Amino acid sequence: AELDSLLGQEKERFQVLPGRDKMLYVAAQNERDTLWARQVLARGDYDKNARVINENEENKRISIWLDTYYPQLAYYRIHFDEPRKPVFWLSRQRNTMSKKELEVLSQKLRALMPYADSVNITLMDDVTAAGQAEAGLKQQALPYSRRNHKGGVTFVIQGALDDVEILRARQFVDSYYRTWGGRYVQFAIELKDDWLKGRSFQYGAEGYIKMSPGHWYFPSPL
Amino acid sequence: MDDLVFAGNKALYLVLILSGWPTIVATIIGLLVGLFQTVTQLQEQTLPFGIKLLGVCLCLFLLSGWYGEVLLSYGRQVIFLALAKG
Amino acid sequence: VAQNALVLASPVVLVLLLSEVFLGLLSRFAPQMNAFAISLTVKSGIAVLIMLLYFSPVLPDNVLRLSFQATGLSSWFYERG
Amino acid sequence: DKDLLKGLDQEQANEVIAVLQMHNIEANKIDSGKLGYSITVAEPDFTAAVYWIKTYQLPPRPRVEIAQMFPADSLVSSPRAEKARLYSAIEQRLEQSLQTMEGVLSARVHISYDIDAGENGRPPKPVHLSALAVYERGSPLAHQISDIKRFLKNSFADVDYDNISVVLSERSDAQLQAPGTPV
Amino acid sequence: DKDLLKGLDQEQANEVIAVLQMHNIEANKIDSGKLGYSITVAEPDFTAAVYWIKTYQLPPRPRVEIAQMFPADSLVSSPRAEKARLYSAIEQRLEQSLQTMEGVLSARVHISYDIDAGENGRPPKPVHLSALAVYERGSPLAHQISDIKRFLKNSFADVDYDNISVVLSERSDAQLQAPGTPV
Amino acid sequence: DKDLLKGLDQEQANEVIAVLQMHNIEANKIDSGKLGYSITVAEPDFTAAVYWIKTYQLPPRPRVEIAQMFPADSLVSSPRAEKARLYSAIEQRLEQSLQTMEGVLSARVHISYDIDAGENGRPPKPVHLSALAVYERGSPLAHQISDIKRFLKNSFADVDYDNISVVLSERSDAQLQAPGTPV
Amino acid sequence: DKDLLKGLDQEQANEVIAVLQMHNIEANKIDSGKLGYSITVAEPDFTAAVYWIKTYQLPPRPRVEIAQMFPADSLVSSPRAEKARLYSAIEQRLEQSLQTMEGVLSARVHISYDIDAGENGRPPKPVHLSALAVYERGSPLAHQISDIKRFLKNSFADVDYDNISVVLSERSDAQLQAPGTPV
Numbered sequence A: 001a002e003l004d005s006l007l008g009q010e011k012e013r014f015q016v017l018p019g020r021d022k023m024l025y026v027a028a029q030n031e032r033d034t035l036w037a038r039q040v041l042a043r044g045d046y047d048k049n050a051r052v053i054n055e056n057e058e059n060k061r062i063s064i065w066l067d068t069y070y071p072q073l074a075y076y077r078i079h080f081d082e083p084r085k086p087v088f089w090l091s092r093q094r095n096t097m098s099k100k101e102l103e104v105l106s107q108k109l110r111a112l113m114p115y116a117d118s119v120n121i122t123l124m125d126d127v128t129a130a131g132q133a134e135a136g137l138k139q140q141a142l143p144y145s146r147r148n149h150k151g152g153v154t155f156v157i158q159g160a161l162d163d164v165e166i167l168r169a170r171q172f173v174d175s176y177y178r179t180w181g182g183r184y185v186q187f188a189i190e191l192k193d194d195w196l197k198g199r200s201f202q203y204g205a206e207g208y209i210k211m212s213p214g215h216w217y218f219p220s221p222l
Numbered sequence B: 001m002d003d004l005v006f007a008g009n010k011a012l013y014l015v016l017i018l019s020g021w022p023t024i025v026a027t028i029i030g031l032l033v034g035l036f037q038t039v040t041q042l043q044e045q046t047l048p049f050g051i052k053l054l055g056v057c058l059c060l061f062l063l064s065g066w067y068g069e070v071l072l073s074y075g076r077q078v079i080f081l082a083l084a085k086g
Numbered sequence C: 001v002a003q004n005a006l007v008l009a010s011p012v013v014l015v016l017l018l019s020e021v022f023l024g025l026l027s028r029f030a031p032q033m034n035a036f037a038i039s040l041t042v043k044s045g046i047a048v049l050i051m052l053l054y055f056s057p058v059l060p061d062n063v064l065r066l067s068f069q070a071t072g073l074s075s076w077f078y079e080r081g
Numbered sequence D, E, F, G: 001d002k003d004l005l006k007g008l009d010q011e012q013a014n015e016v017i018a019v020l021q022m023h024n025i026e027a028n029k030i031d032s033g034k035l036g037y038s039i040t041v042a043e044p045d046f047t048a049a050v051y052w053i054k055t056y057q058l059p060p061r062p063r064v065e066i067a068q069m070f071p072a073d074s075l076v077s078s079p080r081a082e083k084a085r086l087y088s089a090i091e092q093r094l095e096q097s098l099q100t101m102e103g104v105l106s107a108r109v110h111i112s113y114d115i116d117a118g119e120n121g122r123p124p125k126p127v128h129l130s131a132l133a134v135y136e137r138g139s140p141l142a143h144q145i146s147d148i149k150r151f152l153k154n155s156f157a158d159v160d161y162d163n164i165s166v167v168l169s170e171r172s173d174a175q176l177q178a179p180g181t182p183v
């Protein structure tokens, strides 16, 4: 009685992989499917050892391990489109490593993932990431402000936003995060009683002058 | 405002309390005499008046004191509420 | 003016009527009972008791709903010149 | 088989079955007539079924409508009660109209009950409206918010596009395959 | 066969049958008379039928109309109740007239109930109207909105074209072929 | 076997079973009909079961709603009692609507009852709202607070984003495997 | 065996058993039905059981709620009684909501009753609140006080963070091992 025969009438929905620790790994696409699988094992419909996995859970677990043994590595995300050959995106500028060090890192990752045959390490450009973020906001025509730090970039979107703006914003952010992960760019959405949508000015003898950003804001009377 | 509502309510409340006992005894005497006149068939009609006059006067004697204490306390209270503002 | 007063007084009249017919029906069993003279003893107590419950709305039920207001001047008067 | 619930009505029973099937729990519905419906599951699945019944707070409660607080049977009706009943009927009629639009599967609507004051002696406040709705998969939600706002705006004497909130969502994936029976 | 629903009314049963057939589920309607109608399906389709009944919130509720909140049976009516019944009857009569236009299959109408205040001591506000309608396939909707607006404008003492909202949609594809029976 | 609790309600028993199962205590539910449900456990687990029942203060109580304090069957309603019932019905209807949003499992809502003064002869104070909600695992809570605030803002005549508090949390780990039986 | 107590409620018996077991005293609960529960212990433990029953003043008294002093079944109500019932129901509804937050086991809330005066002719004083709660082991209490304060602040028309007191504590060690039987 194979495990695939127990998961259901739809077959392609799940993917079964053998691992070097002599254990079966079931790859799922989402939470709902993950629980649909986990019920089978925990019920005890299968006799040997098995485990269920997904992209989000493994990203978390790997990050927890990196936090301990490589506490200063700058990286983005691990993609599992082909679960036998993951792709690990590292920053080109923020990391200094030798080729040898990169190889060792690769081997230790392979030791953490007994279901993977090899891990491909790829270097990505931060300017590229930041640019694609800004272009996506301009393309949606959301109002925003950008702030830069030595280790990251923030976009703040705030004010009395309209329903359409909210919808489009939340869709875009959800899309981008899936590609680049949260580790470098943060998007903050905050509603305020402010019709200027975060712009601010001072009136002097020379007329209007644009204020620097900040925490405090003038709640609109209008 | 609420002082006005409170004082006006209390006025009706005091009317009710003071008048209640005489009207009760005049009721009970009216019922008892009316029944008695059916239990023995007698068609008199001043007998209720004769008895209930004595009944009401007696309880006016009894309550003569509490009547004056209640009204004094109320008068002092409302004079304070009217004048003591600051 | 008459209508508003009757609409407002109606709750006390009905209870004072029912209280009297109840004594009338009671008198059928004891025809020497002077139900009229009994009702005179009762009704002033009943009237105050009942008016004491529905007393507090007498504040808002006049302060606004019956007060005249300046927008009404448009309809009660006109210029003939 | 272990008894989970007894004395259900029809509309509770079917909601419980739906939620268990979604999590791969095979359940059985039995009808006892005057005693209502009963729901049963196998022992290997009992623990899980208990955990989901707790998490989703099943069986569901009945829907609440404001008209239930102000029965017309009362001997006296203030203006406040009549005005409340009126608004509580308009809400239901709008919901039933939105369900007829193209693609909408269900919706809910809310009105600002200023009836919580009589507005006796005060100039009456403007109306505010909110709507929630669910769409078929593959619907351009952004382009459809406009229609809803346009339709609601003219249903009241004074409403501004600024005062109308609209939230839309898509249908989840379809549950078509049956759950597996315990070994 | 598994029981989905019992004690349905005729107009509810035909709605459930229609919705299930659209998704390729063969269903059966049984009549018990005083006990109403029953709906049954095969086991392979039970799960799907449950999920669709949940998703559409079947069986449908009865239709709401504002005159139900203000029955004439009472000896008393304020001006507010009478005025409410009047508008609640005009709405229905307009829908019944629009259904007679060329190509229209169904429609629904809403009027601004300004009676949610008395308009006592105060000038009465202008009327607002909204209408929804469904058309046969191949109808020039753009050129048909004008006719509706023109017709509705004159049904009231004071209405502006700006205050009339109209939303139109086409009939979906016809369900003519019967669903396949489970093997 | 030792008796823990007797004469329980159905909804009141399934909570006890849930809490015990979470701590690896195998329990049994028995039905005596008019006498209700009974809960029993083995002796080796009796001590632990007692400690948990105390710690969680089981069995749970009935849930409270303000309308229970001012029954509509009274002889008279003060304006206070009418206004209280009204608010205590809007609260429930909002909770039932929030549960329909995508991903929300449960929620609770609170409104500022300004009615603790009549506001008669006073300028009425602004409304304040609070909400709690539980989400499915893997939800970006930060990005989802915006939707809730937007939706609640327009449900009332006068509310500022500053006056709305929202607290969100995720579902705990699922209890799927059954507890072990004492040796 | 010596009789300690007779005629207990179910909720009084389980609290007594819990406190005796904590001090290593093996106790027995007996059911006499209409006569309630009885509690017995062995002679070597009798003295200790007596001393602990005195120290904790067992059995517990019933829980007190302000609504009990002003039953809603009265035929008359002052403004003061109505206002009291109102606040006595808000307190309970808040305690019931706090118990749903993450990892809170139990909580208590208190509200400042201004209702003991009409504040007659005076600007009515602002409201004050107090809350107690019990957390699970390993909770960052310091970081969790903020959430509670935030949630309470918006539940009322006028509350300042300065006027809210919050006290938190962790759960004691678990009593899992059974007491030893007297030799």
Ligand SMILES: CCCCCCCCCCCC[N+](C)(C)[O-]
Binding pocket: B060, B061, B063, B064, B067
């Ligand atoms: C026909 C008698 C009407 C009497 C109404 C006034 C009652 C109060 C009399 C004063 C107090 C009692 N007392 C005995 C001193 O007269």
Ligand SMILES: CCCCCCCCCCCC[N+](C)(C)[O-]
Binding pocket: B067, B068, B069, B071, B072
């Ligand atoms: C008609 C109301 C009842 C009769 C009492 C009226 C008040 C009379 C004055 C009370 C004086 C009391 N006193 C003698 C202690 O001063």
